[PDB]
Ligand binder design. Structure first.
Ligand SMILES: Nc1ncnc2c1ncn2[C@@H]1O[C@H](COP(=O)(O)OP(=O)(O)O)[C@@H](O)[C@H]1O
Ligand SMILES: Nc1ncnc2c1ncn2[C@@H]1O[C@H](COP(=O)(O)OP(=O)(O)O)[C@@H](O)[C@H]1O
Ligand SMILES: Nc1ncnc2c1ncn2[C@@H]1O[C@H](COP(=O)(O)OP(=O)(O)O)[C@@H](O)[C@H]1O
Ligand SMILES: Nc1ncnc2c1ncn2[C@@H]1O[C@H](COP(=O)(O)OP(=O)(O)O)[C@@H](O)[C@H]1O
Ligand SMILES: [Mg+2]
Ligand SMILES: [Mg+2]
Ligand SMILES: [Mg+2]
Ligand SMILES: [Mg+2]
Lengths: 522, 526, 39, 529, 317
């Protein structure tokens, strides 16, 4: 019993693993193939913890799928990459990566070394990026109608398309409201300053983006005012009760006037803190930490509404909305740290909970979407679509370029680099044109999804696309018919398309580079 | 196979399979839930793991307490619980409408049809139905009689006749005593207190409050006639120094001086109260009550009892607000300044001992802005049933108050809406119009079961109802005692506009989301 | 290569003595027999 | 919500081990994948550069060979579609004797291209009808591709040359020798009446020297030893018996009765005298060799030695009838010394040792006889088994050459020419089916590429050269073997040819198998027991 | 309520029984409806051993489905009875059962009793019988109409070219019938199997094909003008029924007894030889003997020396 390696080590090598790799990728391309396009079908996933996730987007589909094949793990990783970078095109990139791996399988089988296939893929990626940038149509940022059209195009393929004309607007407002500048730096920080909050039960079109911040808190005391006209918001980081401190103290009492004296000193310190926070004459005070009973008594004496423990993110959003500044020591609170700009503070009751609104700000740089619906899953889906729309709007804002959708860009770049290929002489032309025909999958998937005969329809699409000045000619998946995207008005941001092509080719290269697998070790 | 190849221990249900399983689960839930809708329904008896008995007729209670684990069952269950947490009624009709929409969609899909056009028909039908509902409601003035009618229509559904009548009287009387010129209707102001006590018809409304506490000190008075009230949040309990105190003496006399000094602070705190009481009014047996959210030491308890003061400790946080809105005083977090304006008034404060527990009744107030409902029951499950009924009735009355409108009941609105949808069906173009038809037929699930639970045949009653509405546009619904068409407004069967709107919205949305499903997955286990 | 190859049926239990050690064992057993027969 | 229930309907009423696959992507694609796997597990054993493969059967018996039918039969296959392809290849082997590897490669290529077409968007029926149209076109144009029809089938050199090209596919090194022996064996059995049989060419396997020591003799060799004491009769008259060399007994049970001492005396003497009279009657007819199909009595053996009669026992009816055919005698059920017309005549009978295997030989010395035997030597049982497989394939090639003597060029020439013609026909044809036609041109590319795949050269380069040359019209050029670079050369001059009937049947059966497996779209497997 | 009496008992009550029956029928209908008509799709079926069965028949597929449901077995034996008596119409049978059940449950779930549904079914069956009787066309069954009917059936079963060749063969087979008033016997048109050349080579042979051949090597392999002698006698050695036994005293007696025991079958075969020689031994007119029972090699050789061909162990039919 002599073993060079461990007992749990397993080695696999040769063509087989390559084949297996491709197979694994295609399997994931086989799961989300029917979720692409305006006629996408809902997919329901059972959470291991007991929940339900009803989605269409690729990343929210592959996040709840547990796979043991490492190539499948790489596919899930590219899905997460596409979600995190640009926020759209997840199913598109997964489908393209899978089908480019499949079309490379043919050359792999024909005793062709993978390095030439990788080089051809890289050349094709460079050419496709170039010809995708070539056909871009510039957008006007200030045109609200054009941005509404772009977001509607990005959102018409998902659940909230029925309320698109509403939800679109919401997204735009948020992306136009978190927009910020400071020290020569622009943020559009949707993640931290554009919160989306879901309250089950209501009507979809009752949802709206607020000119302020809504959080799920209530006044600490019943007598504090629940309706303020022009509050002077002050934010606190520290607490307003007496605390032990850090160093060990162990005070020693011998006289008969030291215990009551100690308690009176504690009360006097709290009173001093409250008087010092009142000195600036605020109207509503928000703190992350607790409020002692005596402290809120003194705050009531000066007609101040106090809100108890609030999460740090909510306080940052409130500070950004009111223009206030979070402070820790009330001894060091200035006038410029008092938040003027909030136009209303409402302690309203929704269902059986109390929600506080700081709505109607002067120029808030942080918003909140009161997103009302019917169920938690429905609101979760609407939340995902709203995030998609925000990401698309941000991509347009940071990049003024557009590119036709519906499959027109895929066929356009395919034809362009095929015409480029038909001139170059060498052995690398075959994988190059293989990638060219590989991009044809998106129109094919759209036609298969809408329920049309893909063979002659796609042949006619290619034939019509061979004619010049027809690079905007795509397929309408609503009825499955050759249309012009200019008259259909569907365009996707160039960022999403180029990112999708780049990462698809890159991950195809990664999975195509590997020919050995060693499994089992610690 | 796809996924099953990547994940050997995974579940996959494809398009036809997903539709079949979804519709089967919806039909099962509908078949279980259809036997409780309406006042003629049958109560269900539920036993948990411990073995406690719960009688119910609610859709939400039954649907949460039912022992199922199906996914779509959970989806519709939380749809129902959200619809309950916002409106407060119409949760059985929610799942019934879901079941019927899904059944009709399966009926029109099994003929080889794509669900997308059925959902388009659902959207068009939802729009037309919303316009019809908006143009069919009656906008009146929410007087006492209208509120009694709405509360009766809800509670008689929930419970039997006499108990429903008593509860409707109590609910209307309570809700009229909280409303102001604005429209907050803070339902938190309504205590719902329970007592395993005399018969279930003895539940009633108390103008003041009922507190599950009492006078802990044995010598404290058990009944004060005209009481001043002092609600406080100060701690009369002994509180040690926060910063690591500790005593150091050298003789027994020093120890006695130390214990006196230790008591001195709280003794002064209680001295403030006693001087306040004597200054305000000590004479003529005018009682003084101190109600403290925090604790009260035995020393302070005895000191207050020696001065004819009744004191309650450890009261609820909401009871501070309820008392300061009912007794008219003011909640106090400190005793820096005490003035006679800080005392509320009470016309009778007394204590009733039930079994081992004690309760304090504060009533005979001049004008309470917060009342309580006292429920008396011979056993726990009756108390829980009455609590659920009271919740549903209060929510229905509040929804009636919020918007000045109300819809005819007894299934009349569904019949009229379906007739209007059938009339509008030619207008919508494409084959998807048949989907609208399904929606219309789906609505008929509501009136039909009203006859089904009453013992009459579905077909004859439905055709009799629809012939009367077609002949004359009068809103006629099912008469559960005869089966003939009866006008809902004339008989007084009223329903909430918000409830019907929420049904028409949520049912359509969730049915549309379910129909679009083509793959049910279970993966994520390692 | 990494893979260990099997040539002889049930070769994981068979024992083999080779070289001078086997001859030592032979001589030792013979010595034991002779010592038994010596007395 | 932690368990997806079974869909009501069929999925809920299935049995435990039953598996139901329905739909295109769940059944058709899986069948295509399995058939591609089955094709690629044998593709490496195609051509004169195919490597032999070793298979351990379920009984732990070693089979080293590159004959596709043998490795396919002795390798357990559990997939249904692969079983379909196995059946098709075995039927091809039974009908012709060659093309089983061709059937595997062609069926795999057809199914892979059909999967590609189905992915593109063609229907199942469209691909099936296109495949049938293309197969009919190929069968219609195949006869125009033939060249160099077999002329004589009697001259040694010509038939040896014709069989050498069917032999090179196995044992690429020692080719001319095996072809020479196969031709010598086959010509001596051709009964100049047209009905040439393949069961009259027997193989005798003797361990010992190398292949170059093999030989053919116009008789038979039995791994037996004579029961008598006389060996090596010079020019014998052979008597063949289907009954034991013993006094025949009643089928009904018979017990002898002795009631007097005289009968007890005379019983043994009379039985011995009767047996002696019978043996003398058989011997006086000039018979020197007696062969029996059963046990030989000791007294009968004695009287065989006394009159100098060779006695060879046989223990197989097939051996008995084959000996009767080769010597010209007929088995008779009683002793009854044979009449003149049923006494086998053979030029000599021997008991000889060559490899420590004592054998009995019935060699003729005039080339005449209806049965000839190959005594092939070797150093291992498995190598002689491979040589015997090669001899069987060569004999079957001769048999299929007796009828339909037409030949077609080999080495990828015929496949490439047929692909070019069929793709021209497809391009000259309208309709949606044309795509399927254009796939046959690719399917016929699978065959030459495999050859190149096994020769260590570039398949794409040789395919490009093949089309480049065939565009001129020289339809008789194909892959060259052992040129260290992808090259092409003529096949009419090189003698590399294949039977027209063999390729006809191979194409027909491969297309039939591919179409049949494509037709089904629902599988119900039932609890593999 | 038998769970009180039999704890291990399975019970499905009224609504439960209806639901389970309708669900089973719907499952069977959904499986079987994907093959009806010539546009249907084949089904490949694998048993435990591993044999492959390609079928489209309703009855064959229904038997080879791996199902255990009771009502499924009910409709399965309904379908096999219909196949046995009428010949076809099995998939459509299952589809019709499924549709009746689906519509009945659709009209019952609305709060109705099945009794009125079944009364309506009976009335509709009577009206349908009247209409079917009044719609049929009566003609003279000739070659063309029979080709049409058989072409329809075979086009349902198999693809075009094979269906047409099978239709021609089937009609030419069942058209050689006896007197018009005499009912047709289909046992005479027998089916023989050959794992042989392509599927389009199946055809009709006017005479017979027998799976047995001449067991003696020397018998001729082809006779042109043949007399036929069909028999049921046994040329095999038939021993004495009552436990006989030979008793002799010397080897000569043994030889005489073996000749005597062969004599009986020798005489029986000599009868055949005499009949053949008396009928015709001339101009190469062959003689064939076809026997149901076995024939011993002694008699094989005796008949073979006369230039006869003899067939042993044939079927009763
Ligand atoms: N109405 C339409 N008709 C045809 N194609 C469309 C339409 N709307 C969007 N598309 C195309 O569908 C793609 C987006 O589909 P989506 O479901 O968002 O996939 P992904 O999640 O991968 O972005 C875009 O590439 C766009 O070109
Ligand atoms: N006395 C009555 N006569 C006729 N119809 C009634 C009567 N009482 C209630 N209804 C109707 O019966 C239905 C009962 O619904 P309910 O059981 O309250 O639904 P949920 O349980 O979901 O709240 C209501 O829609 C109401 O219109
Ligand atoms: N000397 C040669 N040069 C080139 N090709 C050859 C030569 N000899 C044989 N071949 C080709 O190799 C192939 C061998 O195929 P083979 O293994 O016999 O198929 P199967 O096993 O199905 O009979 C034949 O098609 C023949 O054309
Ligand atoms: N060429 C054709 N065109 C249209 N319909 C046909 C054609 N041939 C048969 N049919 C119809 O298709 C049906 C096929 O039924 P079939 O599959 O034979 O039922 P079963 O399998 O139960 O015998 C028949 O009812 C027949 O009317
Ligand atoms: Mg998108
Ligand atoms: Mg209700
Ligand atoms: Mg071969
Ligand atoms: Mg038929």
């Amino acid at each position: 019993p002599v073993l060079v390696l461990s007992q749990n080590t397993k080695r696999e090598s040769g063509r087989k693993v390559q084949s297996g790799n491709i197979n694994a990728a295609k399997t994931i391309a086989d799961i989300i193939r029917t979720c692409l396009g305006p006629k996408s079908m809902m997919k329901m996933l059972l959470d291991p913890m007991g929940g339900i996730v009803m989605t269409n987007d690729g990343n929210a589909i592959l996040r709840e799928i547990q796979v043991q094949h490492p190539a499948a793990k790489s596919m899930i990783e590219i899905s997460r990459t596409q979600d995190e970078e640009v926020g759209d095109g997840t199913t598109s990139v997964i489908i393209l990566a899978g089908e480019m791996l499949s079309v490379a399988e043919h050359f792999l089988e024909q005793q062709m070394h993978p390095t030439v296939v990788i080089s051809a893929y890289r050349k094709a990626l460079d050419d496709m990026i170039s010809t995708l940038k070539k056909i871009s149509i510039p957008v006007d940022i200030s045109d609200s109608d054009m941005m509404l059209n772009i977001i509607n195009s990005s959102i018409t393929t998902k659940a909230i398309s029925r309320w698109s004309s509403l939800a679109c607007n919401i997204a735009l407002d948020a992306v136009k409201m978190v927009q910020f500048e400071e020290n020569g730096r622009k943020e559009i920080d949707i993640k931290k300053y554009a919160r989306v909050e879901k309250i089950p039960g209501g009507i979809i079109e009752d949802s709206c983006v607020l000119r302020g911040v809504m959080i799920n808190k209530d006044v600490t005391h019943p007598r504090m005012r629940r309706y303020i006209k022009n509050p002077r918001i002050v934010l606190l980081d520290s607490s307003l009760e007496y605390k032990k401190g850090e160093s060990q103290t162990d005070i020693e009492i011998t006289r008969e006037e030291d215990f009551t004296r100690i308690l009176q000193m504690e009360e006097e310190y709290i009173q001093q803190l409250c008087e010092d926070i009142i000195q600036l004459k605020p109207d509503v005070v928000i703190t992350e930490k607790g409020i002692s009973d005596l402290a809120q008594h003194y705050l009531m004496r000066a007609n101040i509404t106090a809100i108890r423990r609030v999460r740090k993110t909510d306080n940052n959003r409130i500070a950004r909305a009111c223009g206030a500044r979070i402070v820790s020591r009330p001894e060091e609170l200035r006038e410029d740290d008092v938040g003027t700009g909030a136009g209303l503070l409402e302690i309203k009751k929704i269902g059986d909970e109390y929600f506080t609104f700081i709505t109607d700000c002067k120029d808030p740089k942080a918003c909140t979407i009161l997103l009302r619906g019917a169920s938690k899953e429905i609101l979760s889906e609407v939340e995902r679509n709203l995030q998609d729309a925000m990401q698309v709007c941000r991509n347009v804002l940071l990049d003024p370029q557009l590119v036709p959708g519906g499959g027109a860009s895929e066929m356009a770049v395919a034809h362009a680099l095929t015409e480029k290929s038909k001139a170059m002489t060498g052995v690398e032309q075959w994988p190059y044109r293989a990638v060219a025909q590989a991009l044809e999958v998106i129109p094919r998937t759209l036609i298969q999804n809408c329920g049309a005969s893909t063979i002659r329809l796609l042949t006619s699409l290619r034939a019509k696309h061979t004619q010049e000045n027809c690079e905007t000619w795509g397929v309408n998946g609503e009825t499955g018919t050759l249309v012009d995207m200019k008259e259909l008005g569907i365009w996707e941001p160039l960022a999403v398309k180029l990112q999708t092509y780049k990462t698809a080719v890159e991950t195809a290269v990664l999975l195509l580079r590997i020919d050995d697998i060693v499994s089992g070790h610690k | 196979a796809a996924v099953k190849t990547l994940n050997p221990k995974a579940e996959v249900a494809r398009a036809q399979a997903a539709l079949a399983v979804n519709i089967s689960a919806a039909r099962g839930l509908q078949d279980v839930l259809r036997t409780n809708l309406g006042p003629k329904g049958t109560m269900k008896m539920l036993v948990s793991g411990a073995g406690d008995i719960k009688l119910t007729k609610d859709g939400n209670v039954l649907l949460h307490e039912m022992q199922i684990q199906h996914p779509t069952a959970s989806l519709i269950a939380k749809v129902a619980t959200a619809q309950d947490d916002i409106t407060g009624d119409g949760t059985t009709s929610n799942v019934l409408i879901i079941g019927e929409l899904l059944k009709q969609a399966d009926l029109y899909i099994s003929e080889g049809l794509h669900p997308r056009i059925i959902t388009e028909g659902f959207e068009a039908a939802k729009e037309k139905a919303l316009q019809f509902l908006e143009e069919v409601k009656v906008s009146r003035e929410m007087d006492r009689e209208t509120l009694i009618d709405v509360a009766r229509t809800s509670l008689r559904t929930k419970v039997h006749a006499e108990l429903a009548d008593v509860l409707t009287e109590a609910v209307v009387d309570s809700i009229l005593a909280i409303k102001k010129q604005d429209e907050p209707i803070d339902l938190f102001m309504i205590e719902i207190m329970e007592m395993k006590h005399k018969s279930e018809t003895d539940t009633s409304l108390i103008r003041g409050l009922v507190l599950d506490h009492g006078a802990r000190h044995p010598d404290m008075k058990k009944r004060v006639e005209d009481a001043y009230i002092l609600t406080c949040n100060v701690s009369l309990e002994y509180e040690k120094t926060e910063v690591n105190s500790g005593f150091f003496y050298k003789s027994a006399e020093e120890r006695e001086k130390l214990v006196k000094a230790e008591r001195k602070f709280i003794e002064d705190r209680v001295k403030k109260i006693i001087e306040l009481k004597r200054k305000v009014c000590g004479d003529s047996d005018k009682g003084f009550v101190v109600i403290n959210q925090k604790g009260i030491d035995p020393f302070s308890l005895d000191a207050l009892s020696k001065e004819g003061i009744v004191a309650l400790r450890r009261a609820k946080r909401r009871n501070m607000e309820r008392l300061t809105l009912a007794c008219g005083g003011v909640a106090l977090n400190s005793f820096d300044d005490l003035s006679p304006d800080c005392l509320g008034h009470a016309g009778l404060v007394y204590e009733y001992t039930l079994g081992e527990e004690k309760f304090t009744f504060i009533e005979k107030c001049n004008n309470p802005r917060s009342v309580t409902l006292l429920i008396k029951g011979p056993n726990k499950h009756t108390l829980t049933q009455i609590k659920d009924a009271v919740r549903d009735g209060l929510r229905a009355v509040k929804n009636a108050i919020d918007d000045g409108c109300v819809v005819p009941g007894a299934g009349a609105v569904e019949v009229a809406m379906a007739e209007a949808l059938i009339k509008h069906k030619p207008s919508v173009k494409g084959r998807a119009q048949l989907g609208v038809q399904a929606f219309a037929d789906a609505l008929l699930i509501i009136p039909k079961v009203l006859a089904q639970n009453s013992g009459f045949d579905l077909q004859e009653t439905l055709v009799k109802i629809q012939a009367e509405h077609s002949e004359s546009g009068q809103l006629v619904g099912v008469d559960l005692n005869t089966g003939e068409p009866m006008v809902a407004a004339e008989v007084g069967v009223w329903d909430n506009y918000c409830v019907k709107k929420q049904l028409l919205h949520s049912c359509t949305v969730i049915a549309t989301n379910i129909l679009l499903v083509d793959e049910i997955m279970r993966a994520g286990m390692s | 290569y990494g893979r260990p190859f099997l040539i002889i049926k049930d070769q994981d239990r068979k024992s083999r003595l080779m070289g001078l050690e086997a001859l030592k064992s032979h001589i030792m057993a013979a010595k034991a027999v002779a010592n038994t027969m010596r007395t | 919500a932690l368990h997806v229930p079974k869909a009501p309907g069929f999925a809920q009423m299935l049995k435990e081990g039953a598996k139901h696959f329905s739909g295109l992507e769940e059944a058709v694609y899986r069948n295509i994948q399995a058939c591609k796997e089955l094709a690629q597990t044998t593709r490496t054993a195609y051509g004169p550069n195919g490597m032999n493969k070793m298979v351990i059967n379920h009984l732990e018996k070693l089979f080293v060979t590159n004959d596709a039918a043998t490795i396919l039969r002795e390798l357990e296959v559990q997939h249904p579609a692969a079983k379909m392809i196995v059946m098709a290849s075995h039927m091809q082997e039974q009908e012709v004797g060659d093309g089983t590897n061709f059937v595997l490669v062609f069926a795999g290529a057809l199914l892979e291209l059909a999967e590609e077409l189905l992915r593109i968007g063609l229907s199942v029926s469209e691909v099936i009808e296109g495949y049938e149209i293309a197969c009919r076109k190929a069968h219609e144009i195949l006869p125009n591709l033939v060249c160099c029809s077999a002329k004589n089938l009697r001259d040694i050199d010509e038939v040896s040359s014709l069989l050498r090209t069917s032999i090179m596919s196995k044992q690429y090194g020692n080719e001319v020798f095996l072809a020479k022996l196969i031709a010598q064996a086959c010509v001596s059995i051709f009964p100049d009446s047209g009905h040439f049989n393949v069961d009259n060419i027997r193989v005798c396997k003797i361990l010992g020297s190398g292949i170059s020591s093999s030989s053919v003799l116009h008789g038979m060799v039995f791994k037996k030893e004579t029961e008598g004491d006389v060996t090596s009769v010079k020019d014998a008259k052979i008597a063949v018996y289907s009954c034991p060399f013993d006094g025949m007994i009643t089928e009904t049970k018979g017990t002898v009765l002795i009631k007097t001492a005289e009968e007890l005396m005379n019983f043994s003497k009379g039985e011995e005298n009767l047996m002696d009279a019978q043996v003398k009657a058989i011997a006086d007819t000039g018979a020197n060799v007696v062969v029996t199909g059963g046990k030989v009595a000791d007294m009968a053996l004695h009287y065989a030695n006394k009159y100098n009669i060779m006695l060879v026992r046989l223990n197989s009816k097939w051996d008995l009838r084959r000996l009767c055919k080769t010597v010209g005698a007929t088995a008779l059920p009683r002793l009854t010394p044979p009449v003149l017309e049923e006494m086998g005549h053979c030029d000599s009978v021997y008991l000889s040792e060559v490899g420590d295997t004592q054998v009995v030989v019935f060699k003729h010395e005039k080339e005449d006889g209806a049965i000839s035997t190959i005594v092939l030597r070797g150093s291992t049982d498995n190598l002689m088994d491979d040589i015997e497989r090669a001899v069987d394939d060569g004999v079957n090639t001769f048999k299929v050459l007796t009828r339909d003597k037409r030949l077609v060029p080999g080495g990828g020439a015929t496949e490439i020419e047929l692909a070019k013609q069929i793709t021209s026909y497809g391009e000259t044809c309208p309709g949606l089916e044309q795509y399927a036609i254009k796939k046959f041109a690719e399917a016929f590319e699978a065959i030459p590429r495999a050859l190149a795949e096994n020769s260590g050269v570039k398949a794409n380069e040789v395919i490009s050269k093949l089309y480049a040359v065939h565009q001129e019209g020289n339809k008789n050029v194909g892959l060259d073997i052992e040129a260290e670079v992808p090259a092409v050369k003529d096949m009419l001059e090189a003698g590399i040819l294949d039977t027209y009937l063999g390729k006809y049947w191979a194409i027909k059966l491969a297309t039939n198998a591919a179409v049949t497996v494509l037709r089904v779209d629902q599988i119900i497997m039932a609890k593999p027991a």
